[PDB]
């Protein structure tokens, strides 16, 4: 039954993939090869070509992503060879470095060995490779509350955070056969960070805000023609709203709006003043300004949406269905100023694709 699943996802994936790659005539033979391997081993191994194209396809099918125009230039690193924890760690350091690229960020995915019998070869505990710790000490909130449970799980295993608002979590992960994950402190020289300043308002620096350059999702399974790559971290660059309007603004995250309001010299007393809205805008201006001042790639939600419009035209012109999740595609500020807001999307799940999977702690 799982063999039938795998076989079926394999047939559908290879036909689509080779058709796209112009290699249609090779399909029958490659499929025959695959059927034996699954008969003999209970699985199969992607070629380099397939793995790269599956990764890209998976990004192109990610309904919630506004950034998909650039799906086909994804930079795919194949690390199915890794067998040791040192090799996993060094792969992850390398990805950080090669994806950061001194600020000129490269959309990059590093692919580790797939699950076998639903048994994971490498289990990565981080949600993102770079992410800040979160603490809640008897009333006292420090850092990023999203990270509270992972931070506590790291601190079980003998890591200790300095308890700044921006402690970097260690890389933490578990190898098949070990009962406990290992953790490694990130080398600071690998992590770009950006101080948040405002173009006009010098006092904004009094907030002492910063964010990291590169968002590297490290907790989603990439699935390609029946094969389950649970450990396959990927990155793009940020859209400014993600930092400016959620990570720094949500009440359940850094919750900076009142402080923003103060330093930009408006009152946070009356809803009718639209102080949250004004503050959100200046904070978001800030973010894009600071990342550009520092040479770190970033996109604003207007330019992102325009690019996504182009992705829509391209799909149709290529004769492919478009899928999307309207609720995630719309930016959380000035959504109606984008074309996305004014149309609907088909939120079907097409594979290959990225998927959530259970967190090992919690
Ligand atoms: C190149 C620059 C990129 C930008 C600006 C971009 C932008 C976005 C944004 C704004 C979201 C919504 C995030 C949120 O609200 O939490 C998102 C979600 C997503 N993106 Fe993209 N992205 C980019 C690259 C990529 C790449 C390279 C992949 C895969 C290879 C990808 C796969 C996804 C997935 C799977 C989600 C949804 C994750 C979830 O459900 O939590 N993104 N991205
Ligand atoms: C690759 C990439 C580029 C870019 N500019 N931005 C991103 C944003 O990813 C962060 C978001 C926020 C996270 O929250 C949703 C979520 C929900 C649940 C239940 C589990 C989980 N792991 N993640 C997951 N993705 C990713
Ligand atoms: C479940 C509920 O719809 C939830 O608020 C969603 C909505 N839309 C979103 N859209 C984006 N881009 N990011 C998010 O984290 C959410 N959260
Ligand atoms: Cl984020």
Distance 129 CA to ligand 2 centre (A): 12
Query: Residue 64 CA: which ligand 2 atom is closest?
Result: 25
Question: Contact at 8 Å (CB) between 96 and 215?
Answer: no
- CATH code for residues 193-215+238-303: 3.90.1230.10
CA distances (Å), origin 115, targets 120, 199, 232, 357: 4, 48, 11, 13
Residue 234: its H or E element:
strand 234-235
Q: Which CATH number fits domain 1-80+107-117+221-235+305-329: 2.160.10.10, 3.30.160.40, 3.90.340.10, 3.40.50.2300?
A: 3.90.340.10
How deeply is 19 buried, as exposed, middle or buried, from its count of CB atoms within 10 A (0-12, 13-18, 19+)? exposed
Question: Contact at 8 Å (CB) between 132 and 143?
Answer: yes
Backbone angles phi, psi at 87, to 5 degrees: -70, -35
Residues 6+ apart with CB under 8 A from 317: none
Question: Contact at 8 Å (CB) between 181 and 172?
Answer: yes
d(CA 84, CA 19): 36
Sequence-distant contacts of 163-170: CB under 8 A, at least 24 apart: 163/133, 163/135, 165/132, 165/254, 166/132, 166/193, 166/210, 167/132, 167/133, 167/143, 168/130, 168/131, 168/132, 168/133, 169/126, 169/131, 169/132, 169/133
Query: Residue 235 CA: which ligand 2 atom is closest?
Result: 1
Question: Contact at 8 Å (CB) between 323 and 296?
Answer: no
Residue 65, marked binder: yes
User: Whose alpha carbon is nearest atom 17 of ligand 1?
Assistant: 65
HSE-up of 327 (CA within 13 Å, CB side)?
A: 1
Within 10 angstroms of residue 286's Cβ, the number of other Cβ atoms is 27
* Listed residue (160, 244, 155) closest to 207, CA to CA: 244
Residues 6+ apart with CB under 8 A from 136: 142, 145, 148
Q: Where in the chain is the domain with CATH 3.90.340.10?
A: 1-80+107-117+221-235+305-329
Strands of 164-215, DSSP E: 171-175, 182-184, 193-195, 210-212
Question: Contact at 8 Å (CB) between 90 and 66?
Answer: no
Q: Which tokens go with 195?
A: 């101080």
* Listed residue (92, 170, 187, 89) closest to 132, CA to CA: 170
d(CA 45, CA 209): 46
Stated resolution in angstroms? 2.2
HSE-up of 53 (CA within 13 Å, CB side)?
A: 17
d(CA 164, CA 144): 10
**Order of strands, edge to edge, in the sheet holding 220-224?**
227-229, 220-224, 353-356
* Listed residue (247, 186, 176) closest to 211, CA to CA: 247
Q: Where in the chain is the domain with CATH 3.90.1230.10?
A: 193-215+238-303
Pocket residues for ligand 1 (CB within 6 Å)?
59, 62, 64-67, 70, 74, 107, 109, 220, 234, 236-237, 239, 242, 299, 304, 328, 354
Q: Output DSSP code: residue 248.
A: T
Question: Contact at 8 Å (CB) between 350 and 320?
Answer: no
According to DSSP, the residues that pair with 354 across neighbouring strands are 222
According to DSSP, the residues that pair with 346 across neighbouring strands are 323
User: Whose alpha carbon is nearest atom 25 of ligand 1?
Assistant: 236
Backbone angles phi, psi at 116, to 5 degrees: -100, -75
Q: Where in the chain is the domain with CATH 3.90.440.10?
A: 81-106+121-192+356-360
Class of domain 81-106+121-192+356-360: alpha beta
Residues 6+ apart with CB under 8 A from 222: 54, 55, 58, 109, 111, 229, 232, 234, 352, 353, 354
Residue in 52, 59, 67 to alter for ligand 1 test, most ligand atoms within 8 A of Cβ: 67
Question: Contact at 8 Å (CB) between 107 and 60?
Answer: no
Residues 6+ apart with CB under 8 A from 303: none
């Amino acid at each position: 039954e799982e063999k039938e699943i795998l076989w079926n996802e394999a047939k559908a994936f290879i036909a689509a993939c080779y058709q796209e790659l112009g290699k249609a005539a090779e399909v029958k033979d490659r499929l025959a090869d695959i059927k034996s391997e699954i008969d003999l081993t209970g699985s199969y191994v992607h070629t380099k070509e397939e793995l790269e194209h599956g990764a890209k396809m998976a990004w192109r099918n990610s309904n919630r992503c506004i950034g998909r125009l650039f799906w086909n230039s994804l930079n795919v690193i194949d690390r199915r060879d890794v067998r040791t924890k040192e090799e996993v760690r060094d792969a992850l350091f390398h990805h950080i470095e090669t994806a950061t690229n001194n600020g000129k960020i490269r959309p990059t995915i590093t692919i580790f060995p797939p699950e076998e019998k639903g048994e994971k070869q490498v289990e990565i505990w981080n949600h993102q490779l770079i992410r800040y710790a979160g603490y809640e000490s008897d009333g006292e909130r420090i850092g990023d509350p999203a990270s509270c449970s992972l931070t506590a799980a790291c601190e079980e295993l003998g890591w200790r955070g300095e308890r700044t608002d921006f402690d970097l979590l260690p890389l933490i992960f578990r190898m098949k056969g070990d009962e406990q994950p290992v953790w490694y402190e990130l080398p600071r020289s690998l992590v770009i960070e950006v101080p948040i300043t405002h173009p006009d308002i010098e006092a904004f620096s009094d907030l002492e805000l910063k964010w990291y350059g590169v968002p590297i999702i490290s907790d989603m399974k990439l699935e390609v023609g029946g094969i389950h790559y649970n450990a396959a971290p990927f990155n793009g660059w940020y859209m400014g709203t993600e930092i400016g309007a959620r990570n720094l603004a949500d009440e359940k995250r850094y919750d900076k709006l009142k402080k923003v309001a103060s330093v930009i010299g408006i009152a946070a007393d009356y809803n009718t003043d639209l102080w949250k809205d004004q503050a959100l805008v200046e904070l978001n201006k800030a973010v894009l300004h600071s990342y550009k001042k520092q040479g770190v790639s970033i996109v604003d939600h207007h330019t992102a949406a325009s690019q996504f419009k182009r992705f829509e035209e391209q799909a149709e012109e290529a004769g492919r269905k478009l899928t999307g999740d309207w609720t995630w595609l719309i930016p959380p500020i000035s959504p109606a100023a984008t074309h996305i807001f004014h149309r609907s999307y088909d939120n079907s799940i097409v594979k290959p694709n990225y998927f959530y999977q259970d967190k090992p702690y919690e």
